[PDB]
Write a protein that binds this ligand. Sequence first.
Ligand SMILES: [Zn+2]
Ligand SMILES: [Zn+2]
Lengths: 252, 255, 250, 255, 672, 276
Amino acid sequence: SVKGLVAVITGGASGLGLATAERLVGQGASAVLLDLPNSGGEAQAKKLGNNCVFAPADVTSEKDVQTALALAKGKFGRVDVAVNCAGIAVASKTYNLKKGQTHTLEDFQRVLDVNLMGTFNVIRLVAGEMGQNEPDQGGQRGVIINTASVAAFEGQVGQAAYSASKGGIVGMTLPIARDLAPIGIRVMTIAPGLFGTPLLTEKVCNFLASQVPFPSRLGDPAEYAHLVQAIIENPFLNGEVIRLDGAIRMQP
Amino acid sequence: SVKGLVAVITGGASGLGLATAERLVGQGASAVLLDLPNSGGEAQAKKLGNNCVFAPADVTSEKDVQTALALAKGKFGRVDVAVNCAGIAVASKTYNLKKGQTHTLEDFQRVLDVNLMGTFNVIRLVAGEMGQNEPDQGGQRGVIINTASVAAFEGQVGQAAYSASKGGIVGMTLPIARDLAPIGIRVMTIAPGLFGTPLLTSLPEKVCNFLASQVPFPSRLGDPAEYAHLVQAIIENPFLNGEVIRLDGAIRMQP
Amino acid sequence: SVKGLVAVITGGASGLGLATAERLVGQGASAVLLDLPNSGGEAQAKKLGNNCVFAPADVTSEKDVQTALALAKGKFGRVDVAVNCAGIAVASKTYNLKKGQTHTLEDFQRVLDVNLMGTFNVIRLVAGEMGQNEPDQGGQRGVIINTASVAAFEGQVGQAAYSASKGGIVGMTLPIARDLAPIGIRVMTIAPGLFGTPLLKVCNFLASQVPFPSRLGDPAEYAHLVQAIIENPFLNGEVIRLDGAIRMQP
Amino acid sequence: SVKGLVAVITGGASGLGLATAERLVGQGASAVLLDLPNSGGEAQAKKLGNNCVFAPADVTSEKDVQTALALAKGKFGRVDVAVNCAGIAVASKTYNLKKGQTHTLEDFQRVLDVNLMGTFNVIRLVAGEMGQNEPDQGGQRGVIINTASVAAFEGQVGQAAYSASKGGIVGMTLPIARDLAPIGIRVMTIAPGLFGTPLLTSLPEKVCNFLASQVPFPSRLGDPAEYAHLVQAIIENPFLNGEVIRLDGAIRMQP
Amino acid sequence: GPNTVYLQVVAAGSRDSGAALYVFSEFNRYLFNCGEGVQRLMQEHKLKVARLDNIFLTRMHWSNVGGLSGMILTLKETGLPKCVLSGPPQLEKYLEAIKIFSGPLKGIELAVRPHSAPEYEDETMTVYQIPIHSEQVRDSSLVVAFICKLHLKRGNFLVLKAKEMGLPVGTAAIAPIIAAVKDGKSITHEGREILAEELCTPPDPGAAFVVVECPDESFIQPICENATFQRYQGKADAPVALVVHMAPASVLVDSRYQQWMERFGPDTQHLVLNENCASVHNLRSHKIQTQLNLIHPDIFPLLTVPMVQGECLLKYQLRPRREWQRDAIITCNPEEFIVEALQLPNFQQSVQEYRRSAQYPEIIFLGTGSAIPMKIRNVSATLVNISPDTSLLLDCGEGTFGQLCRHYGDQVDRVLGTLAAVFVSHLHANHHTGLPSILLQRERALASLGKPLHPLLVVAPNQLKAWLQQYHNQCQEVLHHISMIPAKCLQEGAEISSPAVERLISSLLRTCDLEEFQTCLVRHCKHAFGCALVHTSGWKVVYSGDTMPCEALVRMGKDATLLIHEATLEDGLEEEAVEKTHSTTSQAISVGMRMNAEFIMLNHFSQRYAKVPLFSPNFSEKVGVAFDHMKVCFGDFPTMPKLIPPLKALFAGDIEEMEERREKRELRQVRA
Amino acid sequence: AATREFIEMWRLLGREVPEHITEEELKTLMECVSNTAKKKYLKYLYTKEKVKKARQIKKEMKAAAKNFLFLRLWDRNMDIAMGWKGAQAMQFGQPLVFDMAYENYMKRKELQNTVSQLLESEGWNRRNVDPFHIYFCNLKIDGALHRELVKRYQEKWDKLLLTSTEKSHVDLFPKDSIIYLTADSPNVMTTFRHDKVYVIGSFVDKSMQPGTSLAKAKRLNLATECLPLDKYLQWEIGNKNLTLDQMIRILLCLKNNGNWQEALQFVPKRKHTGFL
RNA sequence: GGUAAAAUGGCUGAGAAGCAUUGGACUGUAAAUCUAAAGACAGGGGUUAGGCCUCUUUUUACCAGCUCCGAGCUCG
Ligand SMILES: [Zn+2]
Ligand SMILES: [Zn+2]
């Protein structure tokens, strides 16, 4: 069960991160929101109750994550679940011959810094906090869940920067799982498809929802939260990328 | 939730199939065991209670599956979940130059007939029963879950016949999901690693300890109860479709 | 190089199999066509010259393959390359609720018997012939190349039977490569996309759906990839998608 | 054929990059070496003849690549092939509980900057030069070949930084192929396994004989000449696009 | 000095073995009274001769020097550079007579130490020779007695003294201490000990033993009156530990002799070898004969004042301590032997099959050995019983009488009376050396049986005359017992050399009742002769001896009833047989078949063969084989082939071992 | 305990005796009835102390003394790879049988040496490219050999990739496919056969009693063979019996397509003048 | 069946010592290490100050004994 567990959710002030926070707190767990101060996460933390605490920090900055982790340890005393639902996206073709446009290097670096560099920055820091926990009778110390979109396998036109960042997370999920296996930490990656997040939200949405084989609708963030809970409860789930897409194969 | 659901589990008299049956019945659902009569599945059906009915049938035979499906419809009135946990395995090298031995064609055909041909035979028949269900408010008519071992991606020496059958299930899970998408049936495949099934405990004891130690985390053989938990999660989640999930433990198999 | 090599090509009387036979014979190698007698493969064997011999046999039958392999050994003395380009395809939905139709089991079994069972039947038999060859100075005894369509990863509606057979070949290519590694046999699989074979308004639309080049596959290009695999000694246990970056839709 | 083609090879002063340069120049093509000035690439350029020109540039810097590309255009007039064989590697565990050590962020950023950021920096710039070429009668304007190690699928202990960079290249090879499809540029990725590049032929012998023994067939380290042969095959074949090819030898890496 | 010294009784004085001792020491070995058959007995019981420096002979008599020639040719083949003999001064003349029939023996060196020579001392023992002359250059009344005194040994330093002495332990300072304490001294400056008695073992004084030979009552008084004996007997100077007595029991019961032994002191032991011993000397011979008797009893008949009677392998330590060791005493039990024979894998069924299937002259094969005596086969010898009252000996090898005595037991005296003539074929050793033993025993048997001493008839080459003449003149009177006939005078084309020779051969024909006697020159060596006997009954027996396939023998022995032929080697080494002038198995078979004899017998088997020869498919119903102490009659010819399976079963392991060795030799030859 | 002085004084004399002594070995010392046995036992203890003390000084002498692709974690990786190869060999490898029926004929000293050779033989098989499937037949539980084996291997005994059983070779394989290798066999081994099962007697036999293995094989009517040592090399000095480690290395070379002139390289050079 | 020489049970020696072997270590690139285990010169005996004396086994070499003197194929 997830009763009494303490979880740290990056970017949990909106989108997929908030949905997992709502479910875990409702099930009886405690959550810490880790997202930029401009997102107004303190309003969501107050709404969810006394079990939710907003920690203003930036994933790309080492100092901010360490400060937020110390706040979580001070408030609750331990960290058991780490969910990385933070990440930005950009849309720009690599090269447009007709328009004479070339992809800017700053845009590629900025996306890589948040999606990939930020995710690894969090993982390497929470594990240090996560390593001090007394082993569970099953030998487990905690669960770390990442989020890389389905673009890591099938990118679209102009989705080169997004696919590269998401592709790195999928590739690196196995070495990290092997890295933390002796200390007893499980690392998993979820591959959501088209989800009703603010990042995705009119004619395009209806067409994209119709392109999903079944169900022919956009993803529900509540369903994403359900999959996260299933991974936490199952002790044999490790080192896999799960496509929460709906059997949709993306076209150019 | 899975309360009130009716499920048909192939090969549910032992191994992974029984574990899912125990969990689903315990959660309040109804299950039908579909396994060969020699497995003594009627004893398990009596143990699980009045919500479990043993249907003696052979997956490779069209007539037996149709008879069992009619029994399930007569007893409960509907079919909502189909789980394929039945399958045999063989170990034989493709060609042994030193011993002058060649893989027999009958062994390859027999494994293919049960693991791959049997699975497709069940799927095409339950869907006809599954198609008559009134659509759920979410548009779903039912869930079909398959089981193909991790050998479909990383086979071992002498595991050519097993990998070919399991590999076909992984490859065909996507066309079937697209086939049944308009009628509202979700098709999924689970890839268990090393699990404490009777099919695995036949190996000598030293091998089991070594194989359990080779799993990164947890360093132990798979628990069939954990496999049942994953099946329940797939049923509850409505957005899970057309994916192969490796319930292995981050273990990569060596030659 | 491929000069002086002897190759056995299943289903080489037409389609992809003939294209590889034309290239290998032209490069100076010797080829043996293994396809059903009704395909008229003897005409192609006569056309290609004295280095090509037609062997009428059925892949699904153990006796026919053994007879053809003996003919190849008698004619040339050795077997170095085995290419499996034979296979049939069917199109039928798993279940049609509106029409009340269900996929027939015989159609599924027939496709599985030729595409998957036939391929493994050939592989297990040629390796016995292939095992008697003296090891090359690089340690290699020969190369075995399979053919499984891209449906093994991304099938279409009604392509359930085809994907299952092709999916098995992709899955089994790794255990076989590990099986024959000590004796020195390399096993590879090629995943052609949409190719201008006899098996394939629809054609224009399908050709336009390929990102680049926006045209149907050329069997000559498939033959070129086969030659590259034979020459390269470090290529083993991989599935290569000769498709053109095309991702198939439902 | 590759006769008369002009190719730009990143990091071609040593390792895999030099091997492709030797083969392409020998076949009659023209090559431009793009590697850091401290590698002494001018010696290799002089050795290969008048068809090879050394261009000192850094992949991570936009200005250096643009200067080198202008030099290649001035010397030869066109660019047809772009091969990315440049990249560094680091070995450090994510977290060592016993030693109390944590992976440094600078090491992760430095590896990502060269392997992944550097590769994309080159690709986006050569395509602008590559786009001005008159289309071939087959519609092709040129070929771009990347190099990502097999760690992108199966990383080892302490190979987290290397796998993340190589994993990004594998993931991004498909969107780039779709991006440049209308203009007629083919993008491919090669996944070399354990090749006898200068770096790996420097480890102590016992080690070199283990790694090499773990390869199923051939039981030896990779030969950079074989890597050059695969590159030539990709250039000649016009239907090869959007695929990752594992030039490893059926070796599956263990923790 | 040596740390252990003990005696051993090789032969216990029995009539068929004589008496002999064996002194063993770490530095030297000694032998006493090397009689006939001593070489065979010592070899059987694994007594090494490598360092046999000295041999002591107590009396110039054939009962003590009979086996001297065999020991000499053996030590030589052993590689000993020099051997020294001690005893009567007649040994020098005896050694000269040995060279008559043997070679010069250049290899080994011989030395003689007579009693008149100065005393001899060794690294372990000092020996004194006591010449004794009986009451009332050949000398027939001289007997030498030996008194051996051991060297005084030091005492070990008490190593536990290191806890009290001031000497630096584990250093070189022990060497002057060792030179002091072992000699009775002590370095008092290292402490207070002035003498070794405080820290060293008491040195052991030398213990002496005396060997006394008293062949008859005439020597009793000279032994008693000897002053040198009184020096050790009536004194406390190292009382003699043990006295070995080799004298007949009639001498022992004499009061003067009884008082002589008792004067040596109460602690002195007394060991007696006086022909009253009851101990089996040839265990292996008894084992084989008992086993073969289980097959056919008739063909293989069965054989036959405090003091301590001697036994075989009896020991007595002298240097470590002084005890009657008695640990290797031989034990003869026929029940164990038959149990081992019955438990053989194929012996029981084979003898069962043979048994369920179911007169003069008779032949007894005393010995069937070629060159050296062995555990199972003695040197060549053959006895023929023409009539119940007459007999003929076909060859007299070394120790022949010993085998004869064992075969007949108490009946030997009667048998010797029936001995009419002895034939000697070619003058090699081990073919004639046993003759003096037979003559002396024959004289004793005739005296015991109460018969006139008529000289025996001997047919032998004239070269044998010189050998016996020199021995008779120099050492001991023999020639007055025989009337020798030259072998050449009995040839088919021979001529009467002298009327006395004609008278003797006529006497031989009358005595043996033979119709005719013939000899021929076989191709073995210079003056090598065969023989043939024809009886008035009509049966003819032909003896070949050492030879090669020859035509004169075939012509002379035509239509023989029974043929005895040499079978030294097999077909494998026919080249060696030609080089060594011997015949092979098939060669003998071919010669016999060509001669057309009713039955064929083989003997003179080589030392290469251990127990049985190779049974080639050429072995027909006429070809037989010979073993020691077997009896063959004319009615047993059909039975002999039937015995082949049981003999194969009784010797399955060794013939397999012999076949394996031959196969390995052939493989080595091919691979060479 | 009189042993105390018996020795201390010999230690003062320095007559090749141990510097110290423990209780358990002291009881074994008084369980030796012959002074030669005690002298040999004391010398065995004496040389044990000297080599232990001499090797300690080597530690004192030793005390006087970027971009990477991998981490120095290699002893683990080699062990894991050898484990994977052994696991496969336990299913498809050619069986090899070590017969432990010679426990009665071995004294304590030879029993320890048998275990040491068995440890070496197993290690060489593990490192081979194509290992055997080592069987431990007639291994009686709680026996002298079994107790020694679990002591040396400690916890590794339960994880070694080999089949140990109390049954016999005949009870596990058909009698036709069994060949009992021995030096006394009349048949000469010509070529290695991959379809046969070879039995190696776990024997040392310093006090030579030849024919023990041959008698055991002939008792069950098993085929026997003897390596063709003489045919390929010229023998000079030494018994033709070979150690277990040498035998398994010879078989491994033959199993891997090697020729006789290459397999016999493991015979000690102190017996064969050279090849023919 | 005998004669002589020899015998290193992981391998070479020396007559001490190296190359090796087994269990353990998550090694920061000398782990090229640390630590634990096993170190019996064919096997028995004796003695012994070593070192020798002996028994047995194995391996490799090796295994008949016509003497005289003059006639000079016979004569003593
Ligand atoms: Zn003779
Ligand atoms: Zn002779």
